[PDB]
Design a protein around this ligand. Structure first.
Ligand code: MG
Ligand code: MG
Ligand code: MG
Ligand code: MG
Ligand code: MG
Ligand code: MG
Ligand code: MG
Ligand code: MG
Ligand code: ZN
Lengths: 116, 66, 83, 177
RNA sequence: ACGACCAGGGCUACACACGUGCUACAAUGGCGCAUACAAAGAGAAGCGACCUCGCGAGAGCAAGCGGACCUCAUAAAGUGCGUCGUAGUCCGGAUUGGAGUCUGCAACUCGACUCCAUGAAGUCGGAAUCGCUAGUAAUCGUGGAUCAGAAUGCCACGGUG
RNA sequence: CCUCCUAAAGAGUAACGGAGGAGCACGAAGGUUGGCUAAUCCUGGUCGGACAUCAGGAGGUUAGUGCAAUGGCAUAAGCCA
């Protein structure tokens, strides 16, 4: 049960199991399933090998897993290189999308750091 | 090599999505079913598309048209 | 982000200035206030001093800067650190 | 053995064509492939080391040697003669088989594989590489394993220069960069 | 000039501390299909049906109507069937990347919304502390003002209870 | 009680002279047969870092000796079985 270079849980439903792949959420998974002709509710266990192959092929159509990750990294790196506002924010480690920083930026900032 | 200390080592058939049939000696025991192989793996095909640097100017041209 | 049917936004005066620069072939920094203005393909190579609210900071235009707007490359507030 | 056979007829010939070698014995050959698992976590509990050894065995049809501390170091909190790593040296037909597996199956299964390091050769032919996951080998079962672990592969060859070694590896359709 | 005009910036900064809220930590639930029952309001530089296109936000076309007539406008929790089976999960949605839509001379700083991806923390919270006695608490949705656009706020309205 | 120096190239040789150790350990750390050769550094190598484990080269005993110091030790007296 290996799709796009990663192992996938057999007991789970197909839609959700595909979501284990970095690059597909629910909608993408659904689309993949539609393309295949495979029912959504069926498990990864009790599939034919041909079916699995078809699924893999379908997955291959989208930029997924490592490929996607690298691309994501590149964009960030590009921004950093630019030294634009977003890039600057990224380098700082603070909210890019114009969120408040006075309070509540703990996702970017991590845990609270006491004053020495 | 020594008689008893070693794990069982016997020839198995390694099937693939390619159609490629690969008879290889292994410790697996059962018949093996692969996802990818050396001939299949998108090294030669993928890595040109997989980088995808591109350009901004062309993108700009495409969507606005002036 | 700007609507696609409307097309990209550039200030008229700034555009004219850019055109003039292109015609010349000069490499003197052009001091502008139009931060809201989108960068163009013809803008590449030029240095343009974007106003940051206080001063004009020179921005050497590159290939990657095109889709972006001018204010992005001109940091407004100056923060060093709390301690 | 298939790869050995390939070498015997083709790889050697290719090498001769390339470097313009005088003797057929002057040609490089892969002497040994050495597999090693460094397992520091073994000092806390013995079973982990055993598990690692088992994994190694599964990977490569030989039973591993259990290596011990050459000298005691406090920085890692180990004493001399402490069972700290495990090692397999492959030679002959088995080695060839392992090599075949590595390139035709295992390397392809590496997650986010965009090539192997070309500048990784010690300077005198002998290539070395390391895998982060042991599950890339189809010998290890994904469900059975409790602890994620890896190993280092060391391809030792007769090649005098690193360049020669590189060439040899290329002749064996080794991925590289 | 401590008066007046203008463009750009700031009022949205961020080692941190506090207050008031929203969303959660799941199964008295999530997700999917079907399906029932409101009230109170607003609307002319406005509310905008239907039909067509768009995955969608929306776009195009264009009736109606200063309105118990038309529009906003499908109530939602609920009910029925199915699925998930106690996992950091088909929980949770933060954050980020890409693609967009609309408003507006103009959305870089600094808008809202949509789609695809991404999937932090969080498993009911220390000392302490607040509200509420009935159609109340709790929970579920709906509308309005301010408004070009921009509410988890405020002021209202009904449901279950 | 042991080692070095003082000690004057045999031995020995004093001082409240200059330096250090012992009051054991080991049924293998003893016997023998068979095999093996060190420190350190550089380069490459999953986690892995100045420093574990694996390669290869340089290196040549600078290491080791159950413990002080001296004299020895590859025929190894060093390290395995
Ligand atoms: Mg304010
Ligand atoms: Mg607090
Ligand atoms: Mg957690
Ligand atoms: Mg409004
Ligand atoms: Mg004498
Ligand atoms: Mg004398
Ligand atoms: Mg001997
Ligand atoms: Mg002895
Ligand atoms: Zn294949």
């Amino acid at each position: 049960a290996r799709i796009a270079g990663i192992n996938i849980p057999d007991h789970k439903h197909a839609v959700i199991a595909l979501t284990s792949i970095y690059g597909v959420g629910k909608t993408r998974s659904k689309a993949i399933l539609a393309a295949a002709g495979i029912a959504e509710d069926v498990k990864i266990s009790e599939l034919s090998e041909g079916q699995i192959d078809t699924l893999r092929d379908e997955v291959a159509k989208f930029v997924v897993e490592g490929d996607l990750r690298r691309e994501i990294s590149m964009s960030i790196k590009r921004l950093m290189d630019l030294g634009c506002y977003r890039g600057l924010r990224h380098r700082r480690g603070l909210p890019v999308r114009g969120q408040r920083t006075k309070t509540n930026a703990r996702t970017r900032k991590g845990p609270r750091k006491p004053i020495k | 090599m020594k008689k008893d200390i070693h794990p069982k080592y016997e020839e198995i058939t390694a099937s693939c999505s390619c159609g490629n049939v690969m008879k290889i000696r292994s410790t697996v025991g059962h018949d093996l079913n692969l996802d990818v192989c050396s001939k299949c793996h998108p090294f030669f095909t993928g890595k040109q598309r997989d980088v995808a640097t591109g350009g901004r100017v062309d993108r700009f041209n495409k969507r606005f048209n002036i | 982000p700007r609507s696609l049917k409307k097309g990209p936004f550039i200030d008229l005066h700034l555009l004219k200035k850019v055109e003039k620069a292109v015609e010349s072939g000069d490499k003197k920094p052009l001091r502008t206030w139009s931060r809201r203005s989108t960068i163009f393909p013809n803008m590449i190579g030029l240095t343009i001093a974007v106003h940051n609210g206080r001063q004009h900071v020179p921005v050497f235009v590159t290939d990657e800067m095109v889709g972006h707007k001018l204010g992005e490359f001109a940091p407004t507030r100056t923060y060093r650190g709390h301690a | 053995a298939k790869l050995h056979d390939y070498y015997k007829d083709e790889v050697v010939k290719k090498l001769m064509t390339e470097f313009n070698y005088n003797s057929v014995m002057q040609v490089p050959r892969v002497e040994k492939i050495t597999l090693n698992m460094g397992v520091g976590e073994a000092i806390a509990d013995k079973k982990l080391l055993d598990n690692a050894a088992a994994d190694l065995a599964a990977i490569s049809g030989q039973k591993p040697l259990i290596t011990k501390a050459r000298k005691s170091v406090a920085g890692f909190k180990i004493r001399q003669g402490y069972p700290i790593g495990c090692k397999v040296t492959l030679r002959g037909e088995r080695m060839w088989e392992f090599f075949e597996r590595l390139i035709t199956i295992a390397v392809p299964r590496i997650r986010d594989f965009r090539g192997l390091s070309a500048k990784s050769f010690d300077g005198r032919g002998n290539y070395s590489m390391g895998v982060r996951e042991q599950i890339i080998f189809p010998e290890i079962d994904y469900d059975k394993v409790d602890r994620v672990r890896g190993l280092d592969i060391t391809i030792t060859t007769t090649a005098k220069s690193d360049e020669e070694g590189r060439a040899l590896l290329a002749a064996f359709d080794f991925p590289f960069r």
